[PDB]
Symmetry: D2
Subunit: 445 residues, 4 copies
Amino acid sequence: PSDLLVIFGITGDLARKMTFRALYRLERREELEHPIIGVASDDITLDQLLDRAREAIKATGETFDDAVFDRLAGRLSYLSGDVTDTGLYSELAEKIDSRPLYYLEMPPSLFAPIVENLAKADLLERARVAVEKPFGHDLESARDLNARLRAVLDEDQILRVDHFLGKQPVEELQYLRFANNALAKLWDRDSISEIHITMAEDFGIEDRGKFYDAVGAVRDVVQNHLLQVLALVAMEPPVGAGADDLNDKKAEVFRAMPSLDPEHCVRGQYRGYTEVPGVAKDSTTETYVALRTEIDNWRWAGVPIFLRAGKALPHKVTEVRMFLHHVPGFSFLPNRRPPEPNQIVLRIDPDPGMRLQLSAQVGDSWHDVHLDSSFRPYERLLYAAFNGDRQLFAREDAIEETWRIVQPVLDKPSRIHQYEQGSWGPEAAQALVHGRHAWQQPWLP
Amino acid sequence: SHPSDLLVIFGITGDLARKMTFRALYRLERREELEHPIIGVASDDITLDQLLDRAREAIKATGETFDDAVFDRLAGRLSYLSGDVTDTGLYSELAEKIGGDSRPLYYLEMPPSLFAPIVENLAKADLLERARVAVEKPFGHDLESARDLNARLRAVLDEDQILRVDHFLGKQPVEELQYLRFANNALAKLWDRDSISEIHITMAEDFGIEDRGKFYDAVGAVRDVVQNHLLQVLALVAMEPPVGAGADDLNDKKAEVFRAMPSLDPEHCVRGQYRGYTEVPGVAKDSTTETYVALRTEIDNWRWAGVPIFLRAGKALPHKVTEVRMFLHHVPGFSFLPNRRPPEPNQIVLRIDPDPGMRLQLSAQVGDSWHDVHLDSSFAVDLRPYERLLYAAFNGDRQLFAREDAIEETWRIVQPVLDKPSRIHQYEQGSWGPEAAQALVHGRHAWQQPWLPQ
Amino acid sequence: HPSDLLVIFGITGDLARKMTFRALYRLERREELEHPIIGVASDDITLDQLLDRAREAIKATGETFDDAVFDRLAGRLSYLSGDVTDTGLYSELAEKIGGDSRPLYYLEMPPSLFAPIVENLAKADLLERARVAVEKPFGHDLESARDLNARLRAVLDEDQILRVDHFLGKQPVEELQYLRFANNALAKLWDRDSISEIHITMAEDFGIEDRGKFYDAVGAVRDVVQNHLLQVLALVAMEPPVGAGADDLNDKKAEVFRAMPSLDPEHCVRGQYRGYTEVPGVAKDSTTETYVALRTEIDNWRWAGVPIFLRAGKALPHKVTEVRMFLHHVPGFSFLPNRRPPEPNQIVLRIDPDPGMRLQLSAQVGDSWHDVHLDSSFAVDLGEPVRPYERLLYAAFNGDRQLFAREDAIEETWRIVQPVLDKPSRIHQYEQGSWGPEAAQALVHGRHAWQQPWLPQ
Amino acid sequence: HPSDLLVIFGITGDLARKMTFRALYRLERREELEHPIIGVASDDITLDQLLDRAREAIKATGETFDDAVFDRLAGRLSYLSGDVTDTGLYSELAEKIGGDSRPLYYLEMPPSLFAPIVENLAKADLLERARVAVEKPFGHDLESARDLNARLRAVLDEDQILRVDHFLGKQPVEELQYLRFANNALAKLWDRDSISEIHITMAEDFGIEDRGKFYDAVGAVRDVVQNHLLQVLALVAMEPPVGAGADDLNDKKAEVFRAMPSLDPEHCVRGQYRGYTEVPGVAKDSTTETYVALRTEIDNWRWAGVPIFLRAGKALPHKVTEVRMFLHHVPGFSFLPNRRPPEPNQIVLRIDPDPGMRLQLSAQVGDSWHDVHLDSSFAVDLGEPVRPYERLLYAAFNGDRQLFAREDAIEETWRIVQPVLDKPSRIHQYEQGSWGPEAAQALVHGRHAWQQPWLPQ
Ligand SMILES: [Cl-]
Ligand SMILES: [Cl-]
Ligand SMILES: [Cl-]
Ligand SMILES: [Cl-]
Ligand SMILES: [Cl-]
């Protein structure tokens, strides 16, 4: 683990919205044990920064305790300067035998110049660098950024921070799959006919409309978050407990996926989106996407995978729903076939859990049976980054594969379908699954 | 193909009628399910009014809620005929009261030495053509006695007219367990030796021999629950799917199970007797009759070869529960990694009685804790068994009545233990039984705490 | 308990002349006849005249003739003349048959006479400890088979009834079970998770040489499909028996048929070879099929969704009966080269002649890929028609019922084929020596092409 | 991208004289050499003298000699004399080799010199577009392999390092993959649900013919098990690669080794053939093993619980390398006859020589049951030592890394074997021409007996 936290961009928006609060909460849980150096261009004093931190934490609605804050302030120092100027880094070198985590909450155009400067001042040897999203908007841009970082950093020093990944129950979903033989036996194409992934948020674009309008749902949730979720569900078991062992298995999944077919991709935009501040009146940007893909390997060949994600849907829920085949044969006999086949349902967020849907006879009635059980993201990622736990941080090979996968939809986007806020999305998403299993009502907490 | 339209009960003044039958008839009447006359037959020289009085007291004695209007409907259906079952005159009289237009169900609540004489007499008086005959347990106490009894009945009845009534079977969720296994692919995929490592069958009763000590002492736990009830349960759990929907299609599959089973090894059978058993009225002071049995068996076919099947059944155990517990193999491999192997493997648990259901036991991670997860559901109905059997018999539904070929295979299976019984081990009432039953499963899965109703 | 006396009704008829006399002669040569044989027919001839008939019949077949062997056979043979509908014949028979006898009655007579003979054997109290073997045909559809059967079962138990079908004598019943049930490399593959499709081919490279009138009333479906080929399918598809006896085996076969739906006539192609109508006894406008191709299925846990195609016919290019099982391709990896051969693996069972198994796989040698044929033999060659026939006669005499279809299977197979009998599709002509009508190719159009059968070397 | 220049350090040494010159000559005869070759050594000789030496070496091997072929080879060859620890050599080499060259540096040199040479190539800026092939050995244990490797990786990427092990040149890497991954009949069987046990046998029917002093410091475990045989096992056992490249293949092999526990020294039997101590260079009291038999396992989803027995040794009865996979018996039905052959089905892979596959099954013929051998060939014969060598050289030149173990696998295999190196079990003597020490029989007591290997016809 690191023993020093250095934050570039400590006076920016993300620091104000999330980072200061997250540091405060880690301090409250007594999980901060090391100094923190804030870096920015603002010509202010440490006391002014502390005032800014205090206000930012109180503004979030977090319960404020002065003793906790005073411990945090005691760890904090501030260094002002220009991130393109070697003098800043000479000064930084005086403040730093350390094992620093450099956390860059700065514009992406500055990631490379900062890292290149840290290198010139010999400040990377025992370091890691965490970069805030975005880290690319397509395959070529991600490759260019990545080439500049890798010129001075090993892959294992690079932590690509995506807040959605902080919601993933990575260890728990592995244990569910790999420690339970009743489930592991079912977890392939011989039992599973079809998979549906649903990511629904019951709110619109609340802020940063100008930023969202240049990103869109595909880049925002599909490329990294949802594909990573699919990989966790679909991957072969890792041969070890480390992060690279896990990332080896995820990359294998993506390598067996063909690139998306734009004709099997449906793009939606909620009515009212064009009136959000920062969004262009003629925007073609999607707030919803539904698509069909597949994993063409021994475990999953021929199993269609349908994915839908979108803003302003009826609920907040992320689900992976796996449909089993019916028991084969015996169409000529009664009482061998329920109206719907068995299903394994994984709620990823919120309140993660698993539901096994079966059918049962009671008297001369047959009915569905639900076998249910159970099994912050920002602070989790920050703590993990500091401790060098890379499980929640996508590795370069996966990034490049997932960009390859989504690129055709970015290059030839299909026409926008409008949908009402609070609906399940455009009707054209129903047509996607026409000869298959209908989109089901998601399992809610 | 047709239900019966007349119920004729031999032994209507006997103990089973008093303990169970009258109450069961009353409850069917309350549910408005009796639609036909009932003729009671016994040797007692009494009037119909006296019989009604007996019926009334018998029902009230059980603790059943008594409603006079319901009882009056039942009385309205009942007539009484007195005579001796070894006298030809009784059957001539019966022949005047029952026409060739009837479809009688003859229910014989009588000693088994009388089943053949009664049936042979019904035949001589031409009273069997549209009939079925339901015989109260016991119907044999070993392979030879069952074969002899059976040969005498089959001389005048087809197999499908013979209904062997065993109250324990009335508790079995036959349809529901089939649906569970054959209509749910998530379970069908697990239901073989590639996923299942071991099976434990537990039948516990939390009471001793409350009555009929002299009868039990001649029977014992093996004959009482294992030969018919528990082996029939096992067959339901283990059989291949029937290729038809009828009772005979079902019974063809059960029989195939038993034909792949070797006879029991008396050395792998542990026999117990609870302390205090010898003081039960009617029990001999030096009895070596077992009130508990634990055994090891197997089904040596493609589905189950190499899966050990352990069974235990007994009186005066800690709870009332009948379960089939199926242990899965662990997910194979990765012994060198933490958190791939829970302390116990997944299990499929079928509570047969009471309050039938299924529990799937899995393991889950929450934080840095790992714990058991219980995925529970109820199926079928809480069992009532006597009335269910009586109704089924009357309607000709033969699912809950063991067929002759199965009866003979199960007697073959248990016979060696009856011929050369192993020594009795004493155990305390309220314990799980003799410690020697623990040794049976040494090197395998420990006997688990059963899944009890909430 | 085997029989200890053989009684043959129809000893002067065509089957006796073509087959039965030769088969008895061969059993005598192998020293397998140990009991007297009573021939029965209407012809008013002496025993000597019968012996002359037997002698000529044997020599006519091309069998090597040894006069000492023939004399042993003649020594066992007696003859009884009369009308099989008259009680007097049976009184006479009752003198020749002792109260301690265990007769096999073998009826090589017209089928309209089976019931009258058996009913007469009953009236004369000659059926205790007997069995009765009846020559094909034993019904021409479900209703006619049920009627015949009801008349026999009124006086016989099922296990006294042996329905003789010479084709079944070719079936390697024990050896195919061993192949399937004793080899885990095969048993692991023998279900819908590995097998995508099954093709059954029965080809004969000859037309109708004799008895044209008889064939014209029967047709390929009744001749080979109803009993022979469906029985072969059942052997290939059944669950393993729980015991070694005939009834355990027949329980498993029946289960197969009970999970099969009746045939779809729209998926059935009927053929007739050019020249068939010029065969003596065949009507000039006959619509009787000498060829059939059809689709069926077995709708159970082992085989659901696996299409089963069957073709059988006269005047095809070769003599061969084959069961060809296609495996699925290894799934996945379409995006990679060299994971998928041009055809999937196959398991091929040659049933007749010269039974064997071929496993077809693919192999890489340099930058070449090619088919690999892993061939082996099992059982024994029963191609020459005499061998099956003698095997059945011997089995019947010894009470071995494995090669004789049981009543429940008979009725299920008639149910299965009935719709094709009731609504026969239009006849397609095909050339002798061809593989049959081109419409049989269309049957498998979205599936695996009919492959060249695996022939003996 | 293939290389376009071959630079051979050690061109006047023994390996060059025994193998390399001949291999270059053969590649030239097949018209597969297209680029210049620079020979480097300390000897103060001319190019002509080198050529004369090369000519004689080639003729000595028994290779058919054609002067026109040799002349083409000579036309490609230049010679540079100097000392590999002197910076002047590398300045000279830097003149001869342009900044646009793609050199393959082949080091047929003592291993203590690999790092100094590579470090000198780096100081002279000669590695940018290069690969470096190093002759075995490249370590004698985990620590020595890690140290060597650390020095190379300081200046080379892993993909510029080619670790040359002549045994690997015999491996039918593509063909064995095709066999497994394109045939569903085999892929269905290729896991612990069908396979009970695996035996790997590597037998050579000769002793230590040369370089006794070298072998006596190495031993069978280091010589054939650590790299060759474990790599063979990994090929047999691995999950399918997600691509056709070398790194995709090596990802799968590494995964196998990561699921293998380190060897148990108590389950390892070490042998030494009688006469070994009289081989020149071998110490009179040597405890170096010329034979090993061991037990291991792969503790993953595919193979957990399947014991893997391996045996390798010198002076055994035949030259053959085999992987023999025993299937489980068909389960159940112990109470019935004819459901269980005396031995279970087996899948047998002959790796070398004359690679092929045998599927052992059982068949019924009459009242006899017997073994059936379903044999076929795959790949090509690489038995003669020159072929594997030339194959490796060509592959190295073209940048095909499939036959070259990757660093992660090297380190896992050293971890696996290390306990046996640390605590070697007592030497058992065995006679030349025998199958080895009797203590190797005791290893498989309670499991499947060591079988007679499947030999080429
Ligand atoms: Cl389905
Ligand atoms: Cl286990
Ligand atoms: Cl005739
Ligand atoms: Cl085995
Ligand atoms: Cl050996």
